[PDB]
Nucleic acid binder design. Structure first.
Ligand SMILES: Nc1nc2c(ncn2[C@@H]2O[C@H](COP(=O)(O)OP(=O)(O)OP(=O)(O)O)[C@@H](O)[C@H]2O)c(=O)[nH]1
Ligand SMILES: [Mg+2]
Ligand SMILES: [Mg+2]
Lengths: 56, 506, 81, 271, 86, 74, 116
RNA sequence: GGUUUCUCUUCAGAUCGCAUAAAUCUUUCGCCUUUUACUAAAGAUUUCCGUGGAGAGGAACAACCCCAAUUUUUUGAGGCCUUGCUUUGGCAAGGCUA
């Protein structure tokens, strides 16, 4: 099976990449761009899992 | 866009005192069709719909064992309860022998129930009553069992007073005590008479005689246990009547436990009542539960079969009180006697007062009860309409019999032959006839007469004029008006000189 | 409750024939037969074992003294048992 | 995986009582007499409007001798309610007309005021029977001294089970309860699928509202009707499975985060 | 414990000798706690029971058809027939 | 349990009844018992040879009650 | 002579007033109003001209939110209020007339319809 | 031998999923310079968001004392003879018992 990672793995990845202007990444550039086509799906999945005002 | 069983059915058919033909009548919504349907299921596990109102009546024949195991043949005319459609009631009445009033508990007597009662008395039929929807006193009104009994007894005495209004000699008054009354609630499978209740009581418990028991329950009788003997009032104890203490209290508690305690106490209450229920059936919603519990507890419908066996004349007795009113000769020298016999014999007399149309095409099915004789397919027959008088043979077309059918609610049972006493769907005597017709043997003579055309309870006073948009289309419209005249018993049509085709309805 | 007693209870309205403890055979349309098989019927035609005849407009048949009961073939068509 | 719930009636009754303000306080269908679907379908097919109901575009868009007004007997003016109640008698050219009628028996359920009075208990609002009639009757009543006696084992079929407990009036009140609350089990729904206000706008004669909100009521009824009408069945089928194809690859990982954290991630990535 | 003492060969053909002696061979319709027995397509034998009787094998035979007997007149049972496929 | 003899229909009437051992009598059925033992008055016995002995009222042996038939119509 | 209709309305304690109003608009003559003992509903009996009974039930149910529900049946004829033979009545062609002249109006209309 | 969970494979909405989106096409209608973006009716087809059916692997956890006088386990229906009928056997009757 596929086992889950600790949250700091992704938190660190995203923090590192910041906003892709540093030249270190610069191949992510084109994959980052290619993932645009699926961005309206991430938004739908985000908004339908909204947290419901009786929860913090 | 019943191989093994039809035979046995035919046996009861030929028997001619194993059968009873009844008409189910009553007010709007008072339960008839749900009773008939839940019963259709109890036998076969195998515009009206969309309006949710029954407009035209339906014939249903079924085999039901009564409280002794004796199978019977039942013919049921289930009729609309809407005041406007009493014409189908009168059809079913003239072709039927006794009448089951259905009366709603939380309503009682209202307009159509009263008028239908007057009608069946003046048509000289037997009167048996099912008080229906008694749960609307328990689950809906929540009446203490005593006051439920009050209202029940009130309903019964009022339908009594009403039959007193219209039948001079009180041979029969109504009381559950006699087999006159089922109490029921068609939705939950509850149908019982004092006989049936006492019978389950004894059949599970000790060896009490159920009939003496049955005869003790209704009517202000008490029970002091030390006496073990039932006595008109001598508890100043303030105790309940036997009817309460022995039928209303346990049924009330059955419901209360089911709708209340399904999770906590119902498994042990089922322990006591001897009803075993599986886990899945313990996992039901409450209305399916209720009907399951009550149906496992109460058996099929035995109160109905007992009432109908005991107080319906059964066409063999049947015909003689009938043919007086029906027939224009009544009983004189040839045919009154030949008929009143009811024997499969000779004359082959029949009275068809319904035209059930075949959804597809022009042809219809005539429908009625054969009084004397026996009819087989392919026979040639001579029909007489209402216009036909003894020396009017013009009205007497002649045809053959295409096929014969018996009716499950919306099922056809095609057959080879039908004896006297039974209802029948005839294919092929359709075109020559108008609203009411009667039939005799073809080209073989004895002589014929006709039963009086139907008298109706209502007078159609509402008047509606009709005309096609393209005057080219008049013949098709006239065929339409014929067809609707065939389907509807009281519909009047006329042609006003000033160019109108006019319809008279209620 | 007996399955044969139940078939007998059903036998009302049809023809029933009874061989008695003495061996006479009676035929008639059965009216009502109790659990104890006491068959109270009408129009019985009974032939005795030697050949003698007899008939009655009514008849009663004690239960424990019944030798056999044969009905018309209407029954041969309850099979669930 | 959180499908298929099963509850007890104490739960369901408390749930009902908490949800009491978002719910409709009627027990039957006679309220929506000329305001149900088939009434709105017929109204639409005939391009006539009900007082509080929606309007739509007309479904499609010479001489006559009946219509001669000198021949008419005008007593009471024929209204749109009549033409809709009896669409085949008050209507020429009815095409695609559904037939409304209902007389559904008036369900009479009285709510219990205080939890003290017994479950089964006579009430003021019920009309007092005080039945009176003629000489009642007499019958083949078996007077004793012939003989009779109950073979002394039998008792009223249930005797230690009392008439009611602390679960009865509630068990009954849940017998007429709007859709979710009159069940005891069922399948789990998605949160998007639960229209909590649908029964507010499906109601009839609001009597004293700003024209603003009356017009909004009837626009919502129009939407709801069209939804009911245009239901094309699922009609077709394939089930391609996207996040599974993604997670089965070496390029996507998985974890658990806080909804707010994922939201901020998504805004950064869209930017 | 087994309880099948009749319903095992029930629906089968069997010849039962009565406490009077007639050997009724038929298809068993039901057994009983009292020995209440029913047989469909029933024959009864009085003069002899044929087991390869060259001179005669089916004689002193009465047709019963549906033969319903009680338990008092029950004597002995044996298997005689295979169930009819009807 | 404790079924009643269904002889109220033959009750109040006269019947010709054979009791076991070649015994034949005729008398007016006035009652019975749960064991079917019936006291029927006006018993006149007709022996197999034809001897006629009117003994008055007597009971009918229920164990030995072979068969009675009503002497009249219903 | 015109027909009359016997109307029987089972309805709650509330809507009795609305039944009254509707019958007054349709020429009612309420006969009796009595509770249904054993249930919190009233029964109303009234008479009503068959001419006026067109849409009566629909208007009742509408005004009372489906609380009221009434059936109606032919019961007995009655003398229409007006003088059937009076040339001094002149009937405007479309509007409904007051009581004194329904008979003139009905006979004229029926003759212009069929009898001429 | 049970449920639950994961992975993998395959089959279906006829009133459903007690909820309801978008695109394409056809015909009318409305907006108006043009095209896109739109309007509102009918009709047809697709896509999407969910669900049902069938199986395989793995996983985890539960677990190998009194009774019979009308219907069967107390039944006192016992015996003999004379007559007759029968090829004999056998069978019909009455009588006597104690
Ligand atoms: N409370 C209660 N309601 C019932 C019961 N049985 C049926 N109903 C309801 O009563 C309504 C009457 O429906 P039908 O059974 O068709 O009554 P009906 O009298 O045949 O209808 P018409 O023939 O047109 O008069 C049904 O919708 C049922 O849901 C019952 O036992 N109790
Ligand atoms: Mg009906
Ligand atoms: Mg250009």
């Amino acid at each position: 099976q596929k086992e889950d990672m600790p949250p700091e793995h992704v938190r660190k990845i995203i923090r590192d990449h910041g906003d892709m202007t540093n030249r270190k990444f610069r191949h992510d550039k084109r994959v980052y761009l290619g993932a645009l086509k699926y961005m309206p799906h991430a938004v739908l999945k985000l908004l339908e899992n909204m947290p419901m005002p009786w929860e913090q | 866009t019943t191989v093994y069983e039809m035979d046995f059915l035919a046996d009861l058919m030929d028997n001619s005192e194993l059968i009873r033909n009844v008409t189910l009548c009553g007010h709007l919504h008072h339960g008839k069709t749900c009773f008939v349907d839940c019963l259709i299921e109890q036998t076969h596990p195998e515009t009206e719909q969309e309006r949710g109102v029954g407009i035209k009546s339906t014939p249903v024949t079924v085999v039901l064992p009564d409280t002794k195991g004796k199978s019977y043949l039942f013919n049921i005319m289930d009729t609309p309860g809407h005041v406007n459609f009493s014409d189908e009631v009168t059809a079913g009445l003239r072709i039927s022998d006794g009448v089951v009033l259905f009366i709603d508990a939380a309503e009682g007597v209202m307009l159509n129930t009263e008028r239908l009662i007057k009608h069946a008395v003046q048509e000289r039929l037997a009167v048996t009553v099912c008080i229906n929807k008694i749960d609307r006193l328990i689950l809906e009104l929540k009446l203490p069992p005593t006051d439920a009994y009050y209202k029940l007894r009130h309903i019964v005495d009022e339908v009594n007073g009403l039959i007193s209004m219209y039948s001079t000699d009180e041979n029969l008054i109504l009381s559950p005590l006699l087999g006159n009354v089922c109490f029921s609630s068609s939705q939950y499978s509850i149908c019982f008479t004092l006989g049936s209740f006492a019978k389950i009581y004894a059949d599970t418990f000790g060896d009490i005689n159920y009939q003496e028991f049955a005869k003790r329950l209704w009517g202000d009788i008490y029970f002091n246990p030390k006496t073990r003997k039932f006595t008109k009032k001598a508890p100043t104890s303030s105790s309940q009547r036997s009817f309460v203490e022995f039928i209303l209290e346990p049924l009330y508690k059955i419901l209360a436990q089911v709708v209340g305690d399904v999770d906590t106490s119902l498994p042990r209450t089922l322990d006591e009542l001897g009803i075993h229920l599986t886990k899945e059936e313990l996992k039901l919603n409450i209305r399916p539960l209720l009907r399951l519990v009550c149906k496992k507890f109460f058996g099929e419908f035995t109160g109905f079969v007992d009432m109908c066996v005991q107080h319906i004349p059964s066409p063999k007795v049947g015909a003689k009180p009938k043919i007086e009113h029906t027939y224009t000769g009544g009983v004189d020298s040839d045919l009154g006697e030949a008929m009143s016999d009811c024997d499969p014999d000779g004359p082959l007399m029949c009275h068809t007062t319904k035209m059930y149309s075949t959804d597809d095409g022009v042809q219809f099915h005539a429908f009625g009860r054969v009084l004397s004789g026996t009819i087989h397919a392919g026979q040639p027959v001579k029909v007489l309409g209402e216009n036909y008088t003894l020396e009017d043979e013009e009205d007497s077309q002649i045809c053959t019999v295409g096929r014969l059918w018996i009716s499950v609610a919306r099922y056809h049972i095609e057959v080879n032959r039908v004896p006297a006493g039974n209802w029948v769907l005839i294919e092929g005597v359709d075109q020559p006839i108008v609203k009411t017709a009667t039939i005799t043997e073809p080209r073989g003579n004895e002589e014929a007469q006709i039963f009086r055309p139907l008298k109706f309870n209502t007078t159609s006073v509402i008047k509606i004029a009709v005309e096609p948009v393209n005057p080219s289309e008049l013949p098709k419209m006239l065929d339409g008006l014929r067809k609707v005249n065939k389907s509807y018993p009281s519909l009047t049509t006329k042609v006003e000189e000033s160019g109108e085709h006019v319809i008279l309805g209620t | 409750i007996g399955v044969p007693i139940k078939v007998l209870h059903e036998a009302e309205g049809h023809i029933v024939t009874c061989e008695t403890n003495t061996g006479e055979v009676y035929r008639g349309k059965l009216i009502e037969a109790e659990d104890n098989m006491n068959c109270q019927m009408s129009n019985i035609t009974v032939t005795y074992r030697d050949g003698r005849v007899a008939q009655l407009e009514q008849v009663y048949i004690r239960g424990s003294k019944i030798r056999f009961l044969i009905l018309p073939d209407m029954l041969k068509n309850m099979l669930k048992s | 995986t959180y499908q298929r719930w099963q509850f007890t009636l104490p739960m369901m009754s408390t749930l009902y009582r908490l949800a009491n303000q978002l719910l409709t306080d009627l027990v039957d269908d006679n309220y929506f007499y000329l305001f149900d679907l088939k009434a709105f379908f017929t109204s639409k097919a005939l391009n006539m409007a009900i007082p509080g109901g929606p309007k739509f575009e007309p479904l499609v868009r010479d001489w006559n001798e009946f219509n001669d007004i000198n021949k008419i007997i005008i007593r009471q003016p024929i209204r749109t309610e009549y033409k809709i109640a009896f669409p085949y008698l008050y209507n020429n050219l009815p095409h695609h007309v559904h037939l409304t009628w209902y007389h559904t028996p008036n369900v009479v359920f009285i709510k219990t005021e205080d939890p003290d009075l017994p479950a089964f208990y006579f009430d003021p609002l019920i009309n007092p029977i005080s039945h009176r009639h003629s000489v009642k009757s007499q019958e083949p009543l078996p007077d004793d001294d012939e003989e009779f006696e109950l073979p002394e084992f039998v008792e009223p079929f249930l005797k230690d089970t009392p008439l009611y407990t602390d679960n009865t009036a509630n068990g009954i009140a849940l017998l007429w309860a709007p859709r979710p609350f009159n069940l005891r089990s069922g399948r789990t729904r998605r949160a998007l699928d639960i229209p909590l206000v649908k029964n507010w706008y499906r109601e009839h004669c609001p009597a004293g509202q700003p024209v603003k909100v009356r017009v909004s009521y009837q626009k919502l009824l129009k939407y709801y009707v069209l939804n009911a009408l245009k239901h094309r069945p699922p009609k077709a089928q394939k089930k391609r499975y996207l996040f599974r194809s993604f997670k089965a690859t070496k390029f996507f990982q998985s974890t658990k985060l806080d909804w707010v954290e994922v939201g901020l991630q998504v805004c950064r990535q869209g930017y | 414990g087994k309880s099948s003492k009749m319903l095992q060969h029930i629906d089968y053909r069997m010849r039962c000798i009565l406490q009077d002696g007639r050997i009724f061979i038929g298809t068993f319709k039901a057994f009983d706690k009292h020995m209440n027995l029913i047989l469909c397509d029933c024959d009864e034998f009085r003069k002899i029971k044929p087991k390869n009787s060259k001179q005669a094998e089916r004689e002193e035979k009465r047709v019963l058809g549906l033969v319903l007997l009680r338990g008092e007149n029950l004597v002995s049972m044996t298997v005689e027939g295979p169930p009819p496929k009807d | 349990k404790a079924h009643p003899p269904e002889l109220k229909k033959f009750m109040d009437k006269k019947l010709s009844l054979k009791l076991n051992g070649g015994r034949h009598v005729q008398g007016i059925l006035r009652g019975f018992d749960p064991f079917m033992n019936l006291v029927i008055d006006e018993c006149v016995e007709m022996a197999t040879s034809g001897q006629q002995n009117n003994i008055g009222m007597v009971v009918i042996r229920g164990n030995s009650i072979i068969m009675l038939e009503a002497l009249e119509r219903v | 002579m015109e027909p009359y209709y016997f109307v029987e309305v089972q309805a709650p304690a509330d809507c009795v007033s609305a039944v009254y109003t509707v019958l007054a608009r349709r020429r009612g003559h309420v006969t009796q109003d009595a509770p249904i003992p054993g249930s919190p509903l009233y029964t109303i009996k009234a008479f009503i001209p068959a001419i006026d009974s067109f849409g009566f039930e629909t208007d009742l149910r509408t005004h009372t939110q489906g609380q009221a529900f009434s059936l109606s049946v032919f019961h007995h004829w009655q003398i229409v209020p007006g003088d059937p033979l009076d040339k001094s009545i002149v009937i405007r062609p479309l509007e409904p007339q007051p009581a004194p002249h329904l008979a003139r109006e009905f006979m004229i209309k029926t003759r212009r319809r069929k009898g001429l």
